[PDB]
Design a protein around this ligand. Sequence first.
Ligand SMILES: Cc1ccc(-c2nc(Cn3cnc4c(N)nc(N)nc43)cs2)o1
Length: 167
Amino acid sequence: VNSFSGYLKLTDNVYIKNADIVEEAKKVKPTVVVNAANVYLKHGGGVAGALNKATNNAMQVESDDYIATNGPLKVGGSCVLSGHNLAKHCLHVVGPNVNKGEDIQLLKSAYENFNQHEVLLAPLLSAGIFGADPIHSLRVCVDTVRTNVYLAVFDKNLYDKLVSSFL
Ligand SMILES: Cc1ccc(-c2nc(Cn3cnc4c(N)nc(N)nc43)cs2)o1
C-alpha cells in the first residue's frame, strides 16, 4: 500500500489519472518520477520543462553535469538522477520524438526502462509535444511495463479518450 490516490485501474500493474505531473509529484513525493526527456537532457518544455521549473532549475544543472561527463542518452534510453524536491529519484526516459524523425518503434524500448523500478509516477512517453498518439502510446505502455506505473495525463480530453477508447 502506497500514497497514490484517485487512479483508474487499467491492468494488473497500470493505473491512470487526469493530473498535472508536477502537482502529483509534489503531493505524493514518489520514490521515482519519470521525466519525458530528450537525449541532451535539455528540459525546455512539456513534462521536462514543467518538472525542471518546479525544481528551481536544479534538475537542469544536475543534467548538464551528467551530459558533460557521459554524453547524450540514446533515443529509447534513460538515466537515473536526483528527484530534488519532487521525488527521491528522477528516471529521465527518452521516448522517440516523431517531429524530429525519430523511429516510432523505439517507444517500446523507452518503456522497458520502467521495468528497472518497482513503482513509478510517470507521464505518457512521447505524448504532448513529442507528437505521438497518447492512446498507441498507452497500448505500448500496458504491453511493455510489468512494474507498477501510475500514469498522469494532463489533458482532460485526451484522458477521457484514452480511458474510453482503450481496448
Ligand atoms: C493532443 C494533446 C493535448 C495535450 C497534449 C500533451 N500532453 C503532454 C504531456 N505533458 C506535458 N505537460 C504535462 C504535465 N504538466 N503533466 C502531465 N501529466 N503531462 C504533461 C505533451 S503534449 O497532447
